Protein backbone atom coordinates (compact mmCIF):
# COMPACT_ATOMS: atom_id res chain seq x y z
CA UNK A 1 0.00 0.00 0.00
CA UNK A 2 1.03 3.58 -0.65
CA UNK A 3 2.54 5.50 2.24
CA UNK A 4 -0.33 7.96 2.64
CA UNK A 5 -2.78 5.04 2.73
CA UNK A 6 -0.39 2.92 4.79
CA UNK A 7 -1.95 -0.50 5.21
CA UNK A 8 -2.71 -1.57 8.77
CA UNK A 9 -3.02 -5.23 9.74
CA UNK A 10 -3.99 -6.45 13.20
CA UNK A 11 -2.63 -9.44 15.13
CA UNK A 12 -4.38 -10.81 18.21
CA UNK A 13 -5.58 -14.14 19.62
CA UNK A 14 -2.78 -16.13 18.01
CA UNK A 15 0.65 -17.45 18.91
CA UNK A 16 3.20 -15.04 17.43
CA UNK A 17 6.10 -16.94 15.86
CA UNK A 18 9.01 -14.52 15.50
CA UNK A 19 11.22 -17.05 13.69
CA UNK A 20 10.39 -15.25 10.42
CA UNK A 21 12.21 -12.14 11.69
CA UNK A 22 15.22 -14.20 12.78
CA UNK A 23 15.80 -16.60 9.88
CA UNK A 24 15.19 -13.89 7.27
CA UNK A 25 18.55 -12.11 7.04
CA UNK A 26 17.44 -10.05 4.01
CA UNK A 27 16.26 -7.16 6.22
CA UNK A 28 18.23 -4.11 5.12
CA UNK A 29 17.45 -2.10 8.27
CA UNK A 30 15.98 -3.15 11.62
CA UNK A 31 15.58 -1.04 14.77
CA UNK A 32 13.58 -1.76 17.92
CA UNK A 33 12.46 0.85 20.44
CA UNK A 34 11.25 0.07 23.94
CA UNK A 35 11.48 -3.72 23.59
CA UNK A 36 14.43 -5.94 22.73
CA UNK A 37 13.76 -8.56 20.03
CA UNK A 38 15.76 -11.25 21.85
CA UNK A 39 13.39 -11.13 24.85
CA UNK A 40 10.33 -10.94 22.59
CA UNK A 41 9.27 -14.53 21.85
CA UNK A 42 8.71 -15.28 25.55
CA UNK A 43 6.61 -12.23 26.39
CA UNK A 44 2.87 -11.75 25.99
CA UNK A 45 1.19 -8.72 24.44
CA UNK A 46 -2.45 -7.69 24.30
CA UNK A 47 -2.22 -6.84 20.60
CA UNK A 48 0.20 -6.24 17.74
CA UNK A 49 -0.22 -3.79 14.86
CA UNK A 50 1.64 -4.34 11.59
CA UNK A 51 1.60 -1.06 9.68
CA UNK A 52 3.20 -1.67 6.30
CA UNK A 53 3.91 0.71 3.42
CA UNK A 54 6.51 1.65 0.79
CA UNK A 55 9.08 4.46 0.68
CA UNK A 56 12.54 5.10 -0.74
CA UNK A 57 15.72 4.23 1.10
CA UNK A 58 16.72 7.80 1.91
CA UNK A 59 13.42 8.18 3.80
CA UNK A 60 13.67 4.93 5.79
CA UNK A 61 15.44 6.69 8.67
CA UNK A 62 12.42 9.00 8.92
CA UNK A 63 9.99 6.32 10.19
CA UNK A 64 10.71 6.54 13.92
CA UNK A 65 9.89 8.74 16.92
CA UNK A 66 11.46 12.17 16.80
CA UNK A 67 11.83 12.14 13.00
CA UNK A 68 10.89 14.90 10.57
CA UNK A 69 10.32 15.06 6.83
CA UNK A 70 7.69 14.46 4.20
CA UNK A 71 7.24 10.81 5.18
CA UNK A 72 7.50 11.56 8.90
CA UNK A 73 5.14 14.54 8.88
CA UNK A 74 2.53 14.26 6.12
CA UNK A 75 2.06 10.51 5.56
CA UNK A 76 3.04 8.48 8.64
CA UNK A 77 3.96 9.46 12.20
CA UNK A 78 4.85 7.58 15.37
CA UNK A 79 4.37 8.52 19.03
CA UNK A 80 7.25 9.68 21.19
CA UNK A 81 6.52 6.75 23.54
CA UNK A 82 6.57 4.18 20.73
CA UNK A 83 7.28 0.61 21.86
CA UNK A 84 7.86 -1.68 18.91
CA UNK A 85 10.15 -2.38 16.00
CA UNK A 86 10.74 -1.01 12.50
CA UNK A 87 11.91 -3.17 9.60
CA UNK A 88 12.83 -2.11 6.08
CA UNK A 89 14.06 -4.02 3.06
CA UNK A 90 14.54 -3.30 -0.63
CA UNK A 91 11.93 -4.28 -3.23
CA UNK A 92 13.55 -3.07 -6.45
CA UNK A 93 13.01 -6.39 -8.25
CA UNK A 94 9.27 -6.12 -7.52
CA UNK A 95 8.52 -2.37 -7.28
CA UNK A 96 10.28 -1.18 -10.46
CA UNK A 97 9.32 -1.01 -14.14
CA UNK A 98 11.32 -0.36 -17.29
CA UNK A 99 9.11 2.66 -18.00
CA UNK A 100 9.05 3.65 -14.33
CA UNK A 101 6.68 2.32 -11.68
CA UNK A 102 4.41 5.16 -10.52
CA UNK A 103 1.88 3.11 -8.53
CA UNK A 104 3.34 4.31 -5.21
CA UNK A 105 2.06 7.71 -4.06
CA UNK A 106 2.89 9.89 -1.07
CA UNK A 107 1.43 13.07 0.38
CA UNK A 108 3.62 16.00 -0.66
CA UNK A 109 1.68 18.86 0.96
CA UNK A 110 -0.53 19.06 4.03
CA UNK A 111 -1.74 21.94 6.19
CA UNK A 112 -0.70 20.16 9.40
CA UNK A 113 1.54 17.35 10.62
CA UNK A 114 -0.25 14.07 11.21
CA UNK A 115 -1.12 12.94 14.72
CA UNK A 116 0.26 9.62 16.01
CA UNK A 117 -1.11 6.68 13.99
CA UNK A 118 -3.22 8.97 11.79
CA UNK A 119 -4.27 7.88 8.29
CA UNK A 120 -5.04 10.68 5.81
CA UNK A 121 -6.16 9.88 2.26
CA UNK A 122 -7.90 13.12 1.28
CA UNK A 123 -7.06 14.47 -2.18
CA UNK A 124 -8.02 18.07 -1.37
CA UNK A 125 -6.25 20.62 -3.55
CA UNK A 126 -3.50 22.12 -1.41
CA UNK A 127 -3.73 25.91 -1.04
CA UNK A 128 -0.16 27.20 -1.24
CA UNK A 129 -1.11 30.86 -1.76
CA UNK A 130 -3.56 33.54 -0.68
CA UNK A 131 -6.06 32.71 -3.42
CA UNK A 132 -8.39 29.93 -2.19
CA UNK A 133 -8.40 26.79 -4.32
CA UNK A 134 -12.05 25.90 -4.94
CA UNK A 135 -11.32 22.34 -6.05
CA UNK A 136 -9.39 23.55 -9.12
CA UNK A 137 -5.65 23.32 -9.75
CA UNK A 138 -3.45 26.10 -11.04
CA UNK A 139 -1.60 29.03 -9.49
CA UNK A 140 -0.72 27.98 -5.93
CA UNK A 141 -3.13 25.02 -6.22
CA UNK A 142 -1.23 21.73 -6.39
CA UNK A 143 -2.33 18.13 -5.98
CA UNK A 144 -1.29 16.93 -2.49
CA UNK A 145 0.00 13.55 -3.74
CA UNK A 146 3.10 12.74 -5.81
CA UNK A 147 4.25 9.46 -7.33
CA UNK A 148 7.64 7.83 -6.80
CA UNK A 149 9.97 7.24 -9.72
CA UNK A 150 10.95 3.57 -9.54
CA UNK A 151 13.12 2.19 -12.34
CA UNK A 152 15.71 -0.62 -12.39
CA UNK A 153 18.50 1.95 -12.81
CA UNK A 154 17.29 4.22 -10.00
CA UNK A 155 19.87 4.84 -7.31
CA UNK A 156 19.82 3.06 -3.97
CA UNK A 157 18.63 6.21 -2.21
CA UNK A 158 15.61 6.21 -4.53
CA UNK A 159 15.17 2.47 -4.94
CA UNK A 160 11.91 1.20 -3.43
CA UNK A 161 11.95 -0.07 0.14
CA UNK A 162 9.08 -1.86 1.85
CA UNK A 163 8.75 -0.83 5.50
CA UNK A 164 6.87 -2.71 8.21
CA UNK A 165 6.29 -1.15 11.63
CA UNK A 166 5.29 -3.55 14.38
CA UNK A 167 3.82 -1.89 17.46
CA UNK A 168 3.09 -4.02 20.52
CA UNK A 169 0.32 -2.67 22.75
CA UNK A 170 -0.22 -4.09 26.24
CA UNK A 171 -3.41 -2.68 27.78
CA UNK A 172 -5.07 -3.54 31.10
CA UNK A 173 -6.68 -6.61 29.57
CA UNK A 174 -5.68 -10.27 29.25
CA UNK A 175 -2.97 -10.87 26.66
CA UNK A 176 -4.20 -12.90 23.69
CA UNK A 177 -0.75 -12.89 22.02
CA UNK A 178 2.00 -15.03 23.52
CA UNK A 179 5.04 -16.73 22.05
CA UNK A 180 5.17 -20.45 21.27
CA UNK A 181 5.33 -22.71 24.31
CA UNK A 182 7.83 -25.57 24.36
CA UNK A 183 6.70 -29.04 25.44
CA UNK A 184 8.35 -32.44 25.83
CA UNK A 185 7.42 -36.06 25.23
CA UNK A 186 5.12 -37.78 27.71
CA UNK A 187 6.32 -40.71 29.84
CA UNK A 188 3.86 -42.94 31.69
CA UNK A 189 4.10 -45.42 34.56
CA UNK A 190 7.14 -43.60 35.96
CA UNK A 191 7.39 -41.14 38.83
CA UNK A 192 7.68 -37.83 36.98
CA UNK A 193 7.15 -34.14 37.70
CA UNK A 194 4.28 -33.09 35.43
CA UNK A 195 3.11 -29.63 34.36
CA UNK A 196 -0.15 -29.44 32.38
CA UNK A 197 -1.22 -25.89 31.47
CA UNK A 198 0.40 -24.50 34.61
CA UNK A 199 -1.07 -27.21 36.85
CA UNK A 200 2.11 -28.61 38.40
CA UNK A 201 2.62 -31.72 40.44
CA UNK A 202 4.52 -34.94 41.03
CA UNK A 203 3.27 -38.45 40.42
CA UNK A 204 2.91 -41.37 38.06
CA UNK A 205 0.86 -40.78 34.91
CA UNK A 206 -1.13 -43.85 33.89
CA UNK A 207 -3.71 -44.54 31.22
CA UNK A 208 -7.23 -44.29 32.59
CA UNK A 209 -10.81 -45.15 31.66
CA UNK A 210 -12.47 -42.02 33.07
CA UNK A 211 -14.74 -40.20 30.61
CA UNK A 212 -14.40 -36.44 30.95
CA UNK A 213 -16.90 -34.08 29.39
CA UNK A 214 -15.66 -32.29 26.27
CA UNK A 215 -15.03 -28.97 28.04
CA UNK A 216 -13.53 -30.35 31.27
CA UNK A 217 -9.77 -30.13 31.71
CA UNK A 218 -8.93 -31.66 35.11
CA UNK A 219 -10.20 -34.13 37.67
CA UNK A 220 -10.40 -33.91 41.45
CA UNK A 221 -11.06 -36.16 44.42
CA UNK A 222 -12.83 -35.43 47.70
CA UNK A 223 -9.61 -33.80 48.91
CA UNK A 224 -9.74 -31.47 45.87
CA UNK A 225 -6.24 -32.72 45.00
CA UNK A 226 -5.64 -33.41 41.33
CA UNK A 227 -6.62 -37.01 40.58
CA UNK A 228 -6.79 -37.01 36.78
CA UNK A 229 -5.87 -34.71 33.91
CA UNK A 230 -6.27 -34.55 30.14
CA UNK A 231 -3.23 -34.35 27.89
CA UNK A 232 -3.67 -31.03 26.04
CA UNK A 233 -2.16 -32.23 22.73
CA UNK A 234 -3.94 -35.61 22.57
CA UNK A 235 -7.36 -35.94 24.21
CA UNK A 236 -6.61 -38.91 26.44
CA UNK A 237 -7.28 -39.03 30.18
CA UNK A 238 -4.31 -39.66 32.46
CA UNK A 239 -4.75 -40.78 36.05
CA UNK A 240 -2.19 -39.33 38.46
CA UNK A 241 -1.05 -41.62 41.27
CA UNK A 242 1.22 -40.06 43.92
CA UNK A 243 4.63 -41.70 43.82
CA UNK A 244 5.00 -44.66 46.16
CA UNK A 245 6.21 -43.88 49.67
CA UNK A 246 6.10 -45.54 53.05
CA UNK A 247 8.09 -47.00 55.91
CA UNK A 248 11.17 -49.20 55.95
Amino acid sequence: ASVYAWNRKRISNCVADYSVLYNSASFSTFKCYGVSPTKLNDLCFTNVYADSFVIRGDEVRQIAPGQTGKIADYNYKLPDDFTGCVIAWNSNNLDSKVGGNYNYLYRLFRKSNLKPFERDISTEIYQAGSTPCNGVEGFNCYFPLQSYGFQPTNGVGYQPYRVVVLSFELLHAPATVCGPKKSTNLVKNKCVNFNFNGLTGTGVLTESNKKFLPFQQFGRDIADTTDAVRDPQTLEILDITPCSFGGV
Partner: antibody, heavy 121, light 109 residues
Framework: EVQLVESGGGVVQPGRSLRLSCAAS????????MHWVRQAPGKGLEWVAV????????YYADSVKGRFTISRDNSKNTLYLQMNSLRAEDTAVYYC??????????????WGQGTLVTVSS | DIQMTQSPSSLSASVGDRVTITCRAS??????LNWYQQKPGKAPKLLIY???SLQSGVPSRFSGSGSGTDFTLTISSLQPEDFATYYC??????????FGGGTKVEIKR
Amino acid sequence: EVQLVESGGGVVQPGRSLRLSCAASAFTFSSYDMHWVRQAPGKGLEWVAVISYDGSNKYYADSVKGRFTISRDNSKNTLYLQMNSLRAEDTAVYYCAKDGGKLWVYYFDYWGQGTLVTVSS
Amino acid sequence: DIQMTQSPSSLSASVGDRVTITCRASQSISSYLNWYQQKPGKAPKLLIYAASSLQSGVPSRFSGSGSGTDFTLTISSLQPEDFATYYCQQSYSTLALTFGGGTKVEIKR
Protein backbone atom coordinates in the same frame (compact mmCIF):
# COMPACT_ATOMS: atom_id res chain seq x y z
CA GLU B 1 29.56 -13.45 42.77
CA VAL B 2 29.76 -13.42 38.96
CA GLN B 3 32.99 -13.82 37.00
CA LEU B 4 33.77 -13.10 33.34
CA VAL B 5 37.26 -13.64 31.92
CA GLU B 6 38.30 -12.49 28.44
CA SER B 7 41.05 -13.96 26.28
CA GLY B 8 42.34 -13.99 22.72
CA GLY B 9 43.16 -10.30 22.39
CA GLY B 10 46.36 -9.10 20.82
CA VAL B 11 48.03 -7.20 18.00
CA VAL B 12 46.94 -7.99 14.45
CA GLN B 13 47.50 -6.34 11.08
CA PRO B 14 44.66 -4.68 9.16
CA GLY B 15 42.43 -6.99 7.16
CA ARG B 16 43.15 -10.03 9.34
CA SER B 17 40.89 -12.12 11.57
CA LEU B 18 40.80 -12.62 15.34
CA ARG B 19 38.80 -14.74 17.78
CA LEU B 20 37.96 -13.51 21.27
CA SER B 21 36.67 -15.88 23.93
CA CYS B 22 34.87 -15.07 27.18
CA ALA B 23 34.44 -17.56 30.03
CA ALA B 24 31.54 -16.98 32.42
CA SER B 25 31.30 -18.43 35.91
CA ALA B 26 29.12 -18.32 39.03
CA PHE B 27 25.78 -17.91 37.26
CA THR B 28 23.55 -19.49 34.62
CA PHE B 29 25.36 -18.58 31.40
CA SER B 30 22.60 -20.27 29.38
CA SER B 31 19.75 -18.08 30.71
CA TYR B 32 21.18 -14.59 30.16
CA ASP B 33 21.88 -12.75 26.92
CA MET B 34 25.53 -11.75 26.55
CA HIS B 35 26.88 -8.49 25.18
CA TRP B 36 30.23 -7.56 23.67
CA VAL B 37 31.20 -3.96 24.44
CA ARG B 38 34.34 -2.20 23.19
CA GLN B 39 36.10 0.88 24.57
CA ALA B 40 38.63 2.65 22.37
CA PRO B 41 41.84 3.98 23.98
CA GLY B 42 40.97 7.33 25.53
CA LYS B 43 37.37 7.34 24.29
CA GLY B 44 34.18 6.17 26.00
CA LEU B 45 32.40 2.84 25.86
CA GLU B 46 30.64 1.55 22.76
CA TRP B 47 28.19 -1.33 22.38
CA VAL B 48 29.30 -3.92 19.82
CA ALA B 49 27.16 -7.06 19.75
CA VAL B 50 24.44 -9.02 21.55
CA ILE B 51 23.47 -12.69 21.61
CA SER B 52 20.33 -14.10 23.20
CA TYR B 53 20.30 -16.76 25.91
CA ASP B 54 19.45 -19.62 23.52
CA GLY B 55 22.12 -18.79 20.94
CA SER B 56 19.52 -18.35 18.19
CA ASN B 57 19.48 -14.53 17.90
CA LYS B 58 22.43 -12.26 17.08
CA TYR B 59 22.42 -8.48 16.74
CA TYR B 60 25.13 -5.94 16.01
CA ALA B 61 25.59 -2.20 15.67
CA ASP B 62 25.89 -0.77 12.18
CA SER B 63 29.61 -0.08 12.66
CA VAL B 64 30.24 -3.85 12.72
CA LYS B 65 27.24 -5.37 10.93
CA GLY B 66 28.33 -7.86 8.29
CA ARG B 67 31.89 -7.78 9.66
CA PHE B 68 31.86 -9.47 13.08
CA THR B 69 30.15 -12.65 14.26
CA ILE B 70 28.91 -13.63 17.72
CA SER B 71 28.26 -17.17 18.94
CA ARG B 72 27.97 -19.01 22.24
CA ASP B 73 28.62 -22.49 23.61
CA ASN B 74 26.31 -23.00 26.58
CA SER B 75 27.86 -26.41 27.27
CA LYS B 76 31.26 -24.76 27.83
CA ASN B 77 29.66 -21.55 29.17
CA THR B 78 31.70 -19.60 26.63
CA LEU B 79 31.04 -16.64 24.34
CA TYR B 80 32.94 -16.35 21.05
CA LEU B 81 33.44 -13.20 18.96
CA GLN B 82 34.99 -13.69 15.53
CA MET B 83 36.27 -10.33 14.27
CA ASN B 84 37.13 -10.72 10.59
CA SER B 85 38.55 -7.97 8.37
CA LEU B 86 39.73 -5.84 11.27
CA ARG B 87 40.36 -2.13 10.68
CA ALA B 88 42.36 0.37 12.71
CA GLU B 89 39.15 1.57 14.36
CA ASP B 90 38.80 -1.85 16.03
CA THR B 91 41.70 -1.05 18.37
CA ALA B 92 39.99 -1.16 21.76
CA VAL B 93 39.43 -3.14 24.95
CA TYR B 94 36.65 -5.72 24.62
CA TYR B 95 34.43 -6.76 27.53
CA CYS B 96 31.73 -9.40 27.86
CA ALA B 97 28.74 -8.41 29.98
CA LYS B 98 25.59 -10.07 31.26
CA ASP B 99 22.20 -8.52 30.54
CA GLY B 100 20.29 -9.03 33.79
CA GLY B 101 16.91 -9.16 32.09
CA LYS B 102 15.04 -7.22 34.78
CA LEU B 103 13.60 -4.82 32.17
CA TRP B 104 12.12 -5.03 28.70
CA VAL B 105 15.34 -3.51 27.32
CA TYR B 106 19.08 -4.07 27.51
CA TYR B 107 21.14 -2.98 30.50
CA PHE B 108 24.55 -4.27 31.63
CA ASP B 109 24.73 -5.86 35.08
CA TYR B 110 28.20 -7.39 35.45
CA TRP B 111 31.41 -6.76 33.52
CA GLY B 112 34.66 -8.64 33.08
CA GLN B 113 38.15 -7.19 33.12
CA GLY B 114 38.25 -7.34 29.32
CA THR B 115 41.04 -7.95 26.84
CA LEU B 116 42.99 -5.50 24.68
CA VAL B 117 42.99 -5.74 20.88
CA THR B 118 45.24 -3.55 18.72
CA VAL B 119 45.02 -3.21 14.93
CA SER B 120 48.14 -1.67 13.38
CA SER B 121 50.26 -2.04 10.25
CA ASP C 1 20.53 8.74 16.23
CA ILE C 2 20.42 9.47 19.97
CA GLN C 3 23.16 11.77 21.30
CA MET C 4 23.73 11.93 25.06
CA THR C 5 25.34 15.10 26.42
CA GLN C 6 26.78 14.69 29.93
CA SER C 7 27.64 17.81 31.94
CA PRO C 8 29.75 19.21 33.36
CA SER C 9 32.71 17.98 31.31
CA SER C 10 34.62 17.92 34.61
CA LEU C 11 33.95 19.33 38.09
CA SER C 12 36.11 19.97 41.15
CA ALA C 13 34.68 19.07 44.55
CA SER C 14 35.85 18.11 48.03
CA VAL C 15 34.90 15.10 50.15
CA GLY C 16 31.39 15.24 51.57
CA ASP C 17 30.05 17.67 48.96
CA ARG C 18 26.68 17.01 47.34
CA VAL C 19 27.84 16.31 43.78
CA THR C 20 25.41 16.43 40.85
CA ILE C 21 25.82 15.45 37.19
CA THR C 22 23.32 16.06 34.39
CA CYS C 23 22.67 13.97 31.27
CA ARG C 24 20.49 15.16 28.38
CA ALA C 25 19.17 13.25 25.37
CA SER C 26 18.47 14.42 21.83
CA GLN C 27 14.96 12.92 21.92
CA SER C 28 12.65 11.72 24.69
CA ILE C 29 13.43 8.46 26.50
CA SER C 30 10.92 7.22 29.04
CA SER C 31 13.08 5.86 31.88
CA TYR C 32 15.84 4.20 29.85
CA LEU C 33 18.94 5.87 31.28
CA ASN C 34 21.68 4.07 33.22
CA TRP C 35 24.71 5.34 35.13
CA TYR C 36 28.01 3.44 35.23
CA GLN C 37 31.19 4.23 37.15
CA GLN C 38 34.74 3.67 35.92
CA LYS C 39 37.98 4.28 37.79
CA PRO C 40 41.17 5.09 35.84
CA GLY C 41 42.35 1.85 34.23
CA LYS C 42 39.76 -0.33 35.96
CA ALA C 43 36.70 -1.69 34.17
CA PRO C 44 33.37 0.16 34.35
CA LYS C 45 30.93 -0.87 37.07
CA LEU C 46 27.16 -0.44 37.27
CA LEU C 47 25.66 2.13 39.63
CA ILE C 48 22.10 2.99 38.50
CA TYR C 49 19.68 1.40 36.04
CA ALA C 50 16.36 2.71 34.67
CA ALA C 51 17.54 6.05 36.06
CA SER C 52 15.57 5.45 39.27
CA SER C 53 17.01 2.17 40.60
CA LEU C 54 20.04 1.68 42.83
CA GLN C 55 22.07 -1.35 41.76
CA SER C 56 22.63 -3.99 44.43
CA GLY C 57 25.83 -3.49 46.40
CA VAL C 58 26.14 0.24 45.62
CA PRO C 59 26.26 2.85 48.41
CA SER C 60 22.90 4.50 49.06
CA ARG C 61 24.43 7.98 48.73
CA PHE C 62 24.11 7.63 44.94
CA SER C 63 20.69 8.47 43.52
CA GLY C 64 19.35 8.84 40.00
CA SER C 65 16.38 10.97 39.01
CA GLY C 66 14.74 12.56 36.00
CA SER C 67 12.52 11.50 33.11
CA GLY C 68 11.95 12.50 29.50
CA THR C 69 15.20 14.02 28.25
CA ASP C 70 16.99 15.40 31.34
CA PHE C 71 18.39 13.13 34.06
CA THR C 72 20.51 13.74 37.13
CA LEU C 73 22.84 11.63 39.25
CA THR C 74 23.45 12.93 42.77
CA ILE C 75 25.89 11.94 45.50
CA SER C 76 24.62 13.33 48.80
CA SER C 77 28.01 13.09 50.53
CA LEU C 78 31.11 12.70 48.38
CA GLN C 79 33.70 10.17 49.54
CA PRO C 80 37.37 9.68 48.62
CA GLU C 81 36.49 6.43 46.82
CA ASP C 82 34.03 8.34 44.59
CA PHE C 83 36.56 10.23 42.43
CA ALA C 84 35.97 8.48 39.10
CA THR C 85 34.39 8.88 35.67
CA TYR C 86 30.61 8.47 35.32
CA TYR C 87 28.91 7.48 32.06
CA CYS C 88 25.22 7.84 31.25
CA GLN C 89 23.92 5.44 28.61
CA GLN C 90 20.45 5.24 27.12
CA SER C 91 18.56 2.05 26.29
CA TYR C 92 15.36 3.25 24.59
CA SER C 93 16.83 2.62 21.13
CA THR C 94 17.68 -0.99 21.89
CA LEU C 95 19.97 -1.71 18.94
CA ALA C 96 21.59 1.74 19.04
CA LEU C 97 22.95 1.73 22.58
CA THR C 98 25.14 4.79 23.16
CA PHE C 99 27.19 5.91 26.15
CA GLY C 100 27.68 9.43 27.45
CA GLY C 101 30.74 11.61 27.15
CA GLY C 102 31.61 11.29 30.82
CA THR C 103 32.16 13.71 33.71
CA LYS C 104 35.47 13.32 35.52
CA VAL C 105 35.32 14.45 39.16
CA GLU C 106 38.64 15.76 40.47
CA ILE C 107 39.81 16.56 44.00
CA LYS C 108 39.20 20.22 44.80
CA ARG C 109 42.23 22.14 46.07
